[PDB]
């Protein structure tokens, strides 16, 4: 009836929205990793040059 054509369908919409939200979270955390890893590597290079 209305229930299996509306409520379950909206829940499937919620599943899809959850999947895309998780994709966004992957993107965001990956970009923050791209920044933080570079930040840590530049210091490693800087100290290596400075010590010598």
């Amino acid at each position: 009836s209305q229930k299996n054509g509306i409520a379950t369908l909206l829940q499937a919409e919620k599943e899809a929205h959850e999947i895309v939200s998780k994709a966004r979270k992957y993107r965001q955390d990956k970009l923050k990793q791209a920044k933080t890893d570079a930040a840590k590597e530049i210091d490693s290079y800087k100290i290596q040059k400075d010590k010598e």
Binding site: I19, A23, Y26, L31, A34, K35, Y45
Partner: protein, 52 residues
């Protein structure tokens, strides 16, 4: 025939849409991975050159 055809069809393609969601999420996360790699490598190279 019995209307079980109806449930068969709806469940089949509601699973097809979910696999579509899964594959698009896979593509998105992978592409984010390569973008992460590229940005990190570019920044580290750029700063290391100046340090040297």
């Amino acid at each position: 025939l019995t209307p079980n055809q109806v449930n068969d069809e709806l469940n089949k393609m509601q699973a097809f849409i979910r696999k579509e969601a899964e594959e698009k999420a896979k593509e998105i996360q992978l592409k984010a991975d390569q973008e992460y790699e590229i940005e990190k490598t570019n920044i580290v190279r750029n700063e290391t050159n100046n340090i040297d």
